[PDB]
Write a protein that holds these residues in place. Structure first.
Motif, mmCIF file in Angstrom:
data_model
loop_
_atom_site.group_PDB
_atom_site.id
_atom_site.type_symbol
_atom_site.label_atom_id
_atom_site.label_comp_id
_atom_site.label_asym_id
_atom_site.label_seq_id
_atom_site.Cartn_x
_atom_site.Cartn_y
_atom_site.Cartn_z
ATOM 1 N N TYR B 31 -11.541 -15.619 30.619
ATOM 2 C CA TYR B 31 -12.094 -16.215 31.827
ATOM 3 C C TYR B 31 -12.511 -17.664 31.565
ATOM 4 O O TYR B 31 -12.167 -18.564 32.321
ATOM 5 N N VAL B 32 -13.240 -17.898 30.484
ATOM 6 C CA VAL B 32 -13.689 -19.254 30.189
ATOM 7 C C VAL B 32 -12.544 -20.194 29.837
ATOM 8 O O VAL B 32 -12.675 -21.411 29.960
ATOM 9 N N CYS B 33 -11.412 -19.632 29.428
ATOM 10 C CA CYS B 33 -10.215 -20.432 29.162
ATOM 11 C C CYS B 33 -9.451 -20.785 30.430
ATOM 12 O O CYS B 33 -8.431 -21.479 30.371
ATOM 13 N N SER B 34 -9.919 -20.275 31.567
ATOM 14 C CA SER B 34 -9.230 -20.480 32.834
ATOM 15 C C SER B 34 -7.806 -19.939 32.797
ATOM 16 O O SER B 34 -6.900 -20.521 33.400
ATOM 17 N N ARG B 35 -7.614 -18.831 32.086
ATOM 18 C CA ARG B 35 -6.381 -18.068 32.198
ATOM 19 C C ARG B 35 -6.202 -17.615 33.642
ATOM 20 O O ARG B 35 -7.181 -17.410 34.354
ATOM 21 N N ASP B 36 -4.958 -17.434 34.068
ATOM 22 C CA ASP B 36 -4.688 -16.884 35.391
ATOM 23 C C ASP B 36 -5.054 -15.411 35.431
ATOM 24 O O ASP B 36 -5.520 -14.912 36.449
ATOM 25 N N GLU B 37 -4.853 -14.722 34.310
ATOM 26 C CA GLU B 37 -5.003 -13.273 34.260
ATOM 27 C C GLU B 37 -5.566 -12.774 32.924
ATOM 28 O O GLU B 37 -5.414 -13.436 31.890
ATOM 29 N N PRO B 38 -6.209 -11.598 32.946
ATOM 30 C CA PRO B 38 -6.748 -10.908 31.767
ATOM 31 C C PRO B 38 -5.672 -10.757 30.701
ATOM 32 O O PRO B 38 -4.518 -10.543 31.058
ATOM 33 N N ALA B 311 -7.369 -35.149 24.292
ATOM 34 C CA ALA B 311 -7.503 -34.810 25.704
ATOM 35 C C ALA B 311 -8.932 -35.062 26.172
ATOM 36 O O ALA B 311 -9.839 -35.249 25.359
ATOM 37 N N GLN B 312 -9.129 -35.078 27.484
ATOM 38 C CA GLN B 312 -10.452 -35.304 28.049
ATOM 39 C C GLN B 312 -11.181 -33.975 28.194
ATOM 40 O O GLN B 312 -10.600 -32.998 28.672
ATOM 41 N N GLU B 313 -12.448 -33.936 27.788
ATOM 42 C CA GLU B 313 -13.257 -32.730 27.954
ATOM 43 C C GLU B 313 -13.443 -32.357 29.420
ATOM 44 O O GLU B 313 -14.009 -33.125 30.197
ATOM 45 N N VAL B 314 -12.970 -31.171 29.789
ATOM 46 C CA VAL B 314 -13.258 -30.601 31.097
ATOM 47 C C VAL B 314 -14.211 -29.430 30.914
ATOM 48 O O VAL B 314 -13.950 -28.543 30.101
ATOM 49 N N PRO B 315 -15.317 -29.407 31.670
ATOM 50 C CA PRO B 315 -16.261 -28.303 31.475
ATOM 51 C C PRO B 315 -15.578 -26.974 31.778
ATOM 52 O O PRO B 315 -14.623 -26.950 32.558
ATOM 53 N N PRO B 316 -16.051 -25.880 31.165
ATOM 54 C CA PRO B 316 -15.459 -24.559 31.388
ATOM 55 C C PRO B 316 -16.062 -23.872 32.606
ATOM 56 O O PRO B 316 -17.189 -24.184 32.985
ATOM 57 N N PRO B 317 -15.309 -22.948 33.213
ATOM 58 C CA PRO B 317 -15.779 -22.078 34.288
ATOM 59 C C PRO B 317 -16.999 -21.266 33.877
ATOM 60 O O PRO B 317 -17.180 -20.983 32.697
ATOM 61 N N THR B 318 -17.820 -20.921 34.864
ATOM 62 C CA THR B 318 -18.956 -20.012 34.717
ATOM 63 C C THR B 318 -19.128 -19.470 33.296
ATOM 64 O O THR B 318 -20.049 -18.699 33.011
#
Lengths: 424, 318
Positions: B31-38, B311-318
């Motif tokens: 989830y924190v990797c912003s994967r599309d799916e489990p 690369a530029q740091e993008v904050p992670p999801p929740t």
């Protein structure tokens, strides 16, 4: 891992379990002697000790016993007792190792010619098990790895009796090829069945009367217990020839045996001022490396580790052993305790540190009296809570305790501890 | 033939065993990797009947099927090409052998410690025959930031976040220890743009895959710009790296340090290995204490030369 077994253990298993049409002589004819041996009882249990001359030698994982003159050959029972008087219970040195000679094996003497001595060995590699034969075995065998015929039995393959005959035995007396072939086939099936990784017989003796296993060394894959226990029984894995274990080392080994956690302690210099208590296999090696690199090898008291998620009680028991060990004598410069480790994946850092804290609290008085300074660096689950209670027990007891997190390079505390750099 | 790429942001895995805490750890990572799916599609466990297990994909609640028979799992999930095997040491051999009867499975992680060496030789033999890559036994596994994490590798989200393992960097690594794997995650994230992929081959006498197996993959992976190997006294594995560089198979910057310098065959010592790697042009630090420094130094040179573009740091999801 693979662990050595005594010659007597190996021979017992071989006599019990090898299946060969070739006749094996003097089966089970061995007697074990220690300094606590009741000699009248031993004689009544092995009446064969009177029937013929004997051979006596230490059975403590020493190599080259014959050529180093540690074997008493072709003696009467009294001559064996005589040969034992000045040796049993005495210190001996072999290579760079010194220890007490305290475990001996007596077997019947086997009259034979040099031409009746052979060499066999089997050992494990990633690609399979090598089988070695040489037609001239014994103390005089020499660089046998360079000379022996060799055959690889591949993974999940069979040893072909024709290969034994047509390749392994090419240089063996023609009248002995058949008995030798049967034996080796049997030896290999035994090696595989009981999960050996190393099995050497040198010399293997064949006379008109049959096959004699004169000398045996071996290792088995100890992880195979769950498979082989029914054949192995209460198999014993002896330590290398050297000093006896310290009571505290035995206590930790017993701790270790009682759980899936890994708990190890070996004392190098019990008077050294540098003690470690490291979490993680790799980490404990790296901290020792670091200490030596910085010139501390002569003050390095111990090496070991506590790994694999030990509980609070286990860490308490481990820690209190270390704290007792490091408070036996004062050092003029005080002492250092390095409580280090990498970042755990599943060990509960809060649980283990609570154990160490309890231990520090019970030994606080002597720790102050011995001027012990403590350095701590650790990461993993609940590590923040762990570092807190650790710093806290320092304040409470008056013991200097410097605690660091993953921001500090793992080994940095060693330099701090030794005064090679400042404590931030 | 063995794959160069073991995992990706699309990897689906089957987990053998009852390891709900580990599975949930993987999903939190996903989830924190912003994967599309489990990353976990199903579980296999012969000791119970089919059924479902409850997990969380973000704040959403999802069910993962648990199969009694492996075949049902494979067949219903043809997209799965990784199996993570949490079998106990008594079950690890048969289940791994059985797994390799299904060709969709290209990578197997074997967690258990204590599998007899002679059984592991048979696993290796079949794996080399089938083209299957084995990581382990006796390993926590490995991790590929932004893509996939094997079981418990990389600890809690706390650790995943601190060492920024939720997005890729340019540094690949291999070691025997997972204990030391996590330290490598930490050292690499503080000194470079971060880990690209990390593998722990495990501590057994015959690992399913070797240092050189993975260094080759890294050499053939464009995203990898530099390689770190934490070697060790014993065996001659690290010399295969020397030969690879001398033969010109290996060209990317390699950092290597072998532990065990204070253990006091000759070529098998950490000392000798360290010295020979260095003469071959491997970046070898004076000691572990300078490992971070030299990694950082090699990294800054690759940034200056435009080889690594952070690369530029993008904050992670929740």
């Amino acid at each position: 891992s693979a662990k050595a077994i005594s010659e007597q253990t190996g021979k017992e298993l071989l006599y019990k379990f090898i299946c060969t049409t070739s006749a094996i002589q003097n089966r089970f004819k061995y007697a074990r002697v220690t300094p606590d041996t009741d000699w009248a009882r031993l004689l009544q249990d092995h009446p064969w000790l009177l029937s013929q001359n004997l051979v006596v030698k230490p059975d403590q994982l020493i190599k080259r016993r014959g050529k180093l003159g540690l074997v008493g050959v072709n003696l009467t029972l009294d001559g064996v007792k005589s040969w034992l008087k000045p040796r049993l219970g005495q210190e001996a040195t072999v290579g760079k190792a010194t220890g007490f000679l305290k475990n001996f094996l007596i077997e019947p003497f086997v009259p034979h010619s040099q031409a009746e001595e052979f060499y066999v060995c089997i050992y494990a590699t990633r690609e399979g098990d090598y089988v070695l034969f040489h037609h001239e075995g014994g103390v005089d065998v020499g660089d046998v790895d360079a000379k022996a015929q060799k055959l690889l039995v591949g993974v999940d393959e069979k040893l072909n009796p024709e290969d034994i005959k047509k390749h392994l035995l090419v240089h063996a007396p023609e009248d002995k090829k058949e008995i030798l072939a049967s034996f080796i086939s049997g030896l290999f099936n035994f090696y595989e069945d009981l999960y050996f990784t190393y099995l050497e017989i040198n010399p293997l003796v064949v006379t008109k009367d049959g096959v004699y296993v004169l000398d045996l060394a071996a290792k088995v894959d100890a992880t195979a217990d769950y498979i082989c226990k029914v054949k192995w029984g209460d198999i014993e894995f002896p330590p290398p020839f050297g000093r006896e274990a310290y009571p505290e080392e035995a206590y930790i080994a017993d701790l270790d045996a009682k759980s899936g956690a890994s708990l190890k302690l070996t004392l190098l210099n019990p008077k050294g001022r540098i003690w470690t208590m490291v979490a993680g296999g790799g980490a404990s090696v790296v901290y020792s490396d670091t200490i030596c690199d910085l010139g501390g090898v002569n003050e390095l008291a111990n090496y070991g580790e506590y790994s694999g998620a030990p509980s609070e009680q286990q860490t308490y028991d481990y820690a209190k052993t270390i704290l007792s060990l490091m408070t036996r004598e004062k050092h003029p410069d005080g002492k250092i305790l390095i409580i280090g480790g990498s970042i755990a994946n599943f060990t509960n850092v809060a649980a283990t540190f609570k154990g160490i804290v309890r231990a520090i609290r019970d030994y606080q008085g002597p720790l102050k009296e011995h001027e012990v300074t403590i350095f701590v660096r650790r990461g993993g689950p609940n590590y923040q809570e762990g570092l807190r209670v650790m710093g806290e027990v320092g304040k409470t007891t008056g013991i200097p305790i410097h605690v660091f997190g993953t921001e500090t390079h793992m080994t940095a505390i060693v330099g701090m501890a030794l005064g090679h750099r400042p404590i931030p | 033939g063995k794959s160069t790429t073991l995992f990706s942001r699309h990897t689906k895995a089957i987990v053998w065993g009852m390891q709900t805490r580990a599975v949930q750890g993987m999903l939190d990572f996903d989830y924190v990797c912003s994967r599309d799916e489990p990353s976990v599609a199903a579980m296999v466990y012969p000791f119970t009947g089919d059924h479902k297990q409850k997990f969380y994909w973000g704040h959403k609640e999802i069910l993962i099927p648990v199969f009694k028979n492996m075949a049902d799992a494979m067949r219903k999930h043809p997209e799965v090409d990784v199996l993570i095997n949490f079998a106990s040491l008594r079950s690890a051999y048969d289940s791994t052998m059985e797994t390799m009867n299904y060709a969709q499975i290209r990578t197997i992680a074997i967690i258990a410690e204590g599998i007899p060496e002679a059984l592991t030789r048979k696993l290796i033999k079949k794996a080399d025959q089938k083209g299957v890559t084995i990581i382990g036994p006796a390993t926590v596994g490995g991790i590929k930031p932004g893509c996939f994490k094997i079981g418990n590798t990389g600890g809690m989200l706390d650790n995943i976040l601190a060492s920024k393992l939720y997005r890729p960097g340019s540094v690949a690594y291999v070691s025997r220890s997972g204990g030391m794997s996590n330290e490598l995650n930490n050292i690499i994230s503080r000194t470079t743009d971060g880990v690209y992929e990390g593998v722990a081959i495990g501590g057994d006498r015959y690992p399913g895959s070797t240092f050189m197996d993975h260094v080759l993959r890294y050499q053939d992976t464009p995203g990898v710009k530099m390689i770190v190997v934490l070697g060790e006294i014993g065996g001659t594995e690290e010399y295969k790296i020397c030969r690879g560089i001398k033969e010109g198979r290996l060209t990317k910057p390699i950092v290597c340090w072998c532990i065990g310098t204070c253990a006091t065959q000759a070529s098998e010592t950490a000392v000798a290995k360290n010295q020979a790697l260095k003469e071959a042009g491997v970046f070898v630090p004076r000691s572990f204490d300078e490992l971070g420094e030299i990694i950082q130094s090699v990294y800054e040179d690759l940034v200056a030369n435009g080889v690594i573009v952070p690369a530029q740091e993008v904050p992670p999801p929740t």
